[PDB]
Amino acid sequence: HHLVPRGSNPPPPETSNPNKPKRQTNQLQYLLRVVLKTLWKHQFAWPFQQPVDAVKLNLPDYYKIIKTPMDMGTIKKRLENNYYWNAQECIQDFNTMFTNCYIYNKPGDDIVLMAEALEKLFLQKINELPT
Ligand SMILES: CCN1C(=O)c2cccc3c(S(=O)(=O)NC4CCCCC4)ccc1c23
To answer: Where is the site described as Acetylated histone binding found in this chain?
Structure first.
């Protein structure tokens, strides 16, 4: 088809675990209802709300470089489906999302500023987690 590499996309990350028993917790609830909701509405959130489309965003080699993709849409779905055992698993996924941005992009890029601002807010919000 193409004369320059355009890339391709993996299926989005899994968002449910059919073997996992349900275990609801206060911190997981707070993560879904307060932390993620606050992050989602931040002015710089939109690029992180859905999986990277390597083809449409013209980032052909994105999924060569990023072996563990992550986005806020996926994190939201994982919280909704009770995929996470604890807050730390969720936090790890946020960390994977931000660090993927830092890995793929150059330190001076606009997208990295946006990720850094979101990460700073995230770190503030996780200090609110209930006992
Ligand atoms: C967060 C996922 N993500 C990237 O890592 C990335 C790199 C380059 C552009 C871009 C875009 S984009 O909509 O093509 N371009 C810009 C639009 C607003 C300034 C920062 C990036 C969306 C999501 C991205 C990227």
So the answer is: 105
Cα–Cα distance for residue pair 27/103, rounded to 1 Å: 29
Residue 47 is classified by DSSP as: G
* CA dihedral for 126, 74, 41, 79, sign (positive or negative): negative
How far does the centroid of ligand 1 lie from the alpha carbon of residue 72, in Å?
14
Q: At how many Å resolution was this determined?
A: 1.6
Whose CA is closest to atom 23 on ligand 1? 47
Write out the two tokens for 13. 């990350």
12 lines ligand 1 (CB under 6 A): no
Ligand 1 pocket, residue 72 CB under 6 Å:
no
**Packing angle of the helix pair 72-80, 87-104 (nearest 10 deg):** 170
Residue 24 has which token pair? 């609801």
DSSP at 13: P
Q: How was this structure determined?
A: X-ray
Q: Give me the CATH code for the 25-129 domain, please.
A: 1.20.920.10
**Amino acid (one-letter) located at 16:** S
